[PDB]
Design a protein around this ligand. Structure first.
Ligand code: ZN
Lengths: 105, 48, 152, 48, 223, 93, 157, 52, 49, 223
RNA sequence: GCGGCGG
DNA sequence: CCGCCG
């Protein structure tokens, strides 16, 4: 698997969940700071989402701060999941495109 | 042949502190006591 | 599984504390594996092993806490779960204070010594009432006590 | 005192006679530096 | 008040030098610099090469002689000789005693211009028929030099020894309270120096002082 | 690190591209002679024992220092494959 | 760390300069006595800040280098636009960083001289530096830290 | 003594690669500018000690 | 591949006690085991050496 | 070879100085001593005590003046004055201004043989009807003298200020290894200097070196 | 080939 | 995993 592309078009994105189900019977919680970071850091937003007053354009790669924002917001109660590009849904047969992999080089 | 201690050589004490020689310092500028007597080796505290 | 509001609260709090301990132990673990300076030392096996002893206690607290019944019966007559018993030894006039609770609630540190449901002395008391007199076996012999009373 | 600056080292430092040894690890066994040489006859490899 | 540089010298080994008063913190500013030179720059002498008659390599053994060639050449670097004129760059002491005796550094055949301040140094012990004859090359150098760095070859079968030129064993400086002046915040630098004998505490001090000055001048032409 | 590598990285759509450009330009620096540069007048690279880095130190060093300025052009299909090597030998002794 | 840390000593009495001026003077003489330490639990400022007030950032270090103050001592120092209550160590730290990377303003924008430097405070420093000033520039700060971190480490004792 | 001048001259801006015992991640090998030094051992930068 | 010599530690004509070291082994001096030497050591950090 | 003393000076504040090659651990023997000097010996100027007419304490506030006593006194430490001859051991600067004006260091009335190279130095901003009149004392000294150490008493109600004599701000030196054919264990001393402007990094250096030399001499006559 | 040993 | 000795 390698990275050769032009923003592959197929927009079928993965939704990064911000809340974890069961640890003590049923009760929704904010996944640990670390774990969320793991899932959203250096990612590319599939679709746009205004969360706490700011307009996080579609396709923007959310830096660490941005992910903090999303967490801070989740605290308030404005978003439970996240639209983001990923390899799990790349169209490029053999390989993966820029927008889907993400930031980290 | 004669094996004089040089930079790459590794020494160790009976307690388990093992290590290699990093720099061979000229008595000139190495840690000395009030009375002229200089020390011979400096073990980094952090490994304890 | 049967718990008292008191019992519940206690086990709930302990669980909280062990979560903090796990988060700490973890942080620690992570640092070690990240160090890669001094390997093969009781640095991993200890950190790890420590974290395990925790997680285990946690699984025990979550299990018990995930499916326990709460019996609100402060007004009853016969010794049942949640009952606080007091036994006097006919001979020495010794006053002993105890409370029978489910295995998970037992704890000699408590005000009334909390004894297990399926605990010998625990067995002996369940099903009896003020006045009764009973025995069990003890290394020195066997001492019978009389239930002087039973508060909530 | 430093030795390089002759200025003291703020704070007492422990020192003493420690028994330390040199190990069967001379760097004599430590520096094969290759430029060019022999190749295997059957399989093309720069064996030495 | 001009630094009263006093001196108390006993022998050619010890040599304390007092010098005060000195404005706040110069005692140290001088004390250390001089110390560093004293041990690293001062010139002297050491046994640079030796040769025993029936020995081919340094790791050999000579009949009727307790000590091994290495136990010996080891003891020779402990030999402190003393030349008197530059015309003495490379001296070759000669020694040879036989039978039941204890070879001491005093048994070297005298060389009119140079003296051995290291007399009772134990060189070797001889049982019977202990035929020991050897020539030890000595030089005037500076600092430390590994026998592998110079590789002296007077005779095809002689073994080079390690160079121990620094004629000082230990230097120490002390900064004490004030003696004269209108202020109490002052330095009283007194440094005590230790020499093997080759040169004198004072001799050293001065040379060091010079080397220092010598370098100071190097700040002349910019570029 | 290296002289404005960040500036360099900014000049390419992909990291690895920079390398390729950097390289091939270091090649043309030696092949067609070492006088095929564009910024030799002032601030041309330099060495320490004798200011001689003006003649032949490292190639890539040059390439980069040249690429740092808006002198050279790089493209997918800029000049006809073969016509480039022909014209280069012609204009460079 | 050892250079950014601050010291706290013993306090015979209530450190109230929160309000008294005879508290600036008295508390400041009781300090010249053997009563109140150069780092007493005084709310507004411990006598330590009262005595020494440094204008230029350099001003402080030199006083240190002359023996007046130790690096880990709470003093007052006039910076770009604020009279800040910090220690020489801390300040020194600022400079180091602000030196590694030329943009001095962007420097103190990414460091917190409010706590001793911990592996993390640094971790995050590096990370921030990378995103903020570029790759190579950060490299420079690392080397910088490496250097100082080590020197102080040796003289700290 | 002139050869050294040469060697140090040929190395100017070239770099070499270094490898650790078990190569585990991409950083198991990094590139560095060599600076000629005395002795046998190889001088390695502390900060990268964590990598390899 | 290590040196293995025996260095006599006794002098000519000496009254020896039964079971007394006549010569020292490869790494034993005075009859004691020795492997390396005792050096004066300061326990602190240097630049990074 | 002869230490190549290269120089890179920009302005009168910064000054880079390289000096190699040098023998084993010598850059450090030079560097440190020079630094020790460059900060404690170099003579210059610093404001000693100040006095604002209506002000009594160090911690207060003059109406019509944004700056606090503290800030002003602070600012004054920044003041860099330069005397011309010995006759000026202690000079009193006077300055009075009112109304809506910015009080710069160039507002002090000119004194005969004294010069103010820190003109645009912002001392205080005066609001409407801002009465600011003070007298700042300036002296020639060496090093740093805490306001609590000297304690000048021109006017019994005035305030003593820490003395910033040294016109040198900080000093940094590095001992990097340098190559020379045969051996590589060589010292290369590059020392960088920062000055307030009163004198240049190059002058300061020389002065230092001289001062050091001068002391080397005092090791002349025994007793 | 099998023993030993470094990280 | 990589490396080296006998
Ligand atoms: Zn894709």
């Amino acid at each position: 698997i390698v990275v050769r592309e032009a923003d592959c078009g197929t927009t079928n994105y993965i939704s990064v969940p911000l809340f974890q189900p069961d640890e003590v019977t049923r009760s929704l919680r904010l996944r640990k700071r670390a774990d969320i970071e793991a899932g959203l850091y250096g990612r590319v937003l599939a679709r746009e989402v205004e969360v706490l007053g700011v307009r996080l354009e579609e396709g923007r790669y959310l830096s660490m701060d941005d992910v903090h924002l999303l967490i801070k917001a989740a605290e308030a109660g404005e978003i439970q999941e996240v639209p983001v590009r990923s390899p799990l849904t790349c169209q490029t047969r053999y390989g993966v495109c820029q927008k889907c992999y993400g930031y980290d080089l | 042949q004669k094996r004089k201690l040089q930079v790459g050589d590794k020494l160790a004490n009976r307690h388990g502190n093992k290590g290699v020689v990093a720099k061979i310092l000229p008595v000139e500028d190495m840690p000395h006591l009030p009375d002229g007597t200089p020390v011979d080796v400096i073990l980094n505290p952090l490994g304890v | 599984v049967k718990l008292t509001k008191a019992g519940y609260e206690r086990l709930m709090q302990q669980l909280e504390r062990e979560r903090e301990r796990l988060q700490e132990a973890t942080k620690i673990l992570q640092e070690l594996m990240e160090s890669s300076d001094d390997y093969d030392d009781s640095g991993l096996e200890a950190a790890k092993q420590e974290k395990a002893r925790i997680e285990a206690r946690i699984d025990s607290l979550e299990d018990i806490l995930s499916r326990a019944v709460i019996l609100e019966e402060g007004s009853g007559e016969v010794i049942g779960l949640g009952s606080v018993v007091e036994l006097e030894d006919p001979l020495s006039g010794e006053r002993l204070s105890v409370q029978v609770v489910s295995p998970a609630e037992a704890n000699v540190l408590d005000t009334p010594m909390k004894i297990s449901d399926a605990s010998p002395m625990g067995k002996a008391l369940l099903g009896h009432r003020v006045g009764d007199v009973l025995s069990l076996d003890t290394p020195k012999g066997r001492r019978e006590f009389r239930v002087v009373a039973i508060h909530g | 005192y430093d030795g390089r600056t002759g200025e003291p080292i703020e704070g007492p430092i422990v020192v003493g006679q420690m028994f330390i040894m040199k190990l069967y690890h001379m760097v004599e066994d430590k520096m094969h530096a290759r430029s060019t040489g022999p190749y295997s006859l059957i399989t093309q490899q720069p064996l030495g | 008040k001009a630094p009263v540089f006093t001196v108390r010298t006993q022998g050619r080994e010890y040599g304390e030098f007092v010098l005060e008063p000195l404005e706040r913190g110069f005692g140290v500013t001088l004390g250390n610099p001089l110390r560093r030179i004293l041990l690293s720059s001062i010139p002297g002498t050491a046994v640079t090469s030796v040769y025993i008659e029936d020995v081919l390599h340094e790791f050999s053994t000579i009949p009727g002689v307790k000590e091994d060639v290495v136990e010996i050449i080891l003891n020779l670097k402990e030999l402190v000789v003393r030349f008197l004129n530059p015309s003495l760059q490379t001296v070759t002491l000669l020694l040879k005693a036989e039978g039941p005796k204890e070879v001491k550094a005093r048994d070297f055949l005298p060389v009119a211009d140079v003296e051995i301040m290291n007399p009772d140094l134990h060189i070797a012990t001889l049982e019977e028929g202990g035929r020991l004859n050897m020539e030890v090359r000595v030089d005037r150098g500076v600092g430390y030099v590994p026998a592998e760095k110079h590789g002296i070859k007077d005779r095809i079968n002689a073994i080079p020894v390690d160079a121990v030129f620094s004629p000082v064993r230990r230097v120490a400086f002390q900064v004490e309270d004030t003696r004269l002046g209108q202020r109490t915040d002052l330095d009283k630098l007194t440094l005590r120096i230790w020499t093997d004998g080759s040169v004198t505490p004072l001799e050293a001090l001065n040379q060091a002082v010079e080397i220092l000055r010598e370098h100071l001048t190097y700040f002349s032409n910019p570029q | 690190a290296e002289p404005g590598i960040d500036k360099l990285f900014g000049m390419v759509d992909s990291k690895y591209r920079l390398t390729v450009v950097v390289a091939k330009r270091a090649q043309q620096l030696l092949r067609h002679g070492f006088k095929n540069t564009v910024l030799e007048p002032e601030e041309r690279p330099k060495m320490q024992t004798l200011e001689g880095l003006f003649d032949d130190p490292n190639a890539v060093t040059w390439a980069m220092k040249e690429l740092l300025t808006g002198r050279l052009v790089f493209g997918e299909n800029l000049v006809p494959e073969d016509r480039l090597q022909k014209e280069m030998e012609r204009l460079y002794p | 760390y050892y250079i950014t840390q601050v010291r706290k000593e013993k306090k015979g009495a209530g450190l109230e300069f929160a309000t008294p001026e005879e508290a600036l003077a008295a508390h400041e003489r009781g300090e010249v006595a053997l009563n109140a330490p150069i780092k007493v639990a005084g709310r507004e400022t411990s006598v330590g800040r009262l005595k020494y007030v440094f204008a230029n950032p350099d001003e402080a270090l030199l006083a240190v280098a002359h023996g007046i103050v130790d690096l880990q001592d709470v003093v007052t120092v006039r910076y770009m636009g604020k009279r800040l209550e910090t220690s020489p160590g801390r300040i020194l730290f600022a400079r180091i960083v602000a030196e590694a990377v030329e943009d001095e303003k962007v420097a103190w924008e990414l460091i917190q001289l409010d706590v001793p430097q911990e592996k993390n405070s640094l971790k995050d420093l590096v990370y921030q530096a990378f995103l903020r000033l570029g790759m190579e520039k950060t490299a420079r700060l690392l080397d910088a830290l490496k250097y100082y971190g080590f020197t102080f480490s040796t003289t700290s004792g | 003594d002139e050869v050294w001048d040469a060697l140090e001259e040929v190395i100017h801006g070239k770099v070499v690669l270094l490898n650790r015992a078990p190569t585990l991640h991409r950083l198991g090998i990094q590139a560095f500018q060599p600076v000629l030094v005395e002795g046998q051992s190889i001088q390695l930068h502390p900060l990268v000690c964590e990598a390899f | 591949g290590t040196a293995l010599d025996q260095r006599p530690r006794v002098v000519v004509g000496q009254r020896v006690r039964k079971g007394d070291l006549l010569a020292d082994g490869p790494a034993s001096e005075n009859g004691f085991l020795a492997l390396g030497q005792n050096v004066l050591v300061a326990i602190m950090p240097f630049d990074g050496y």
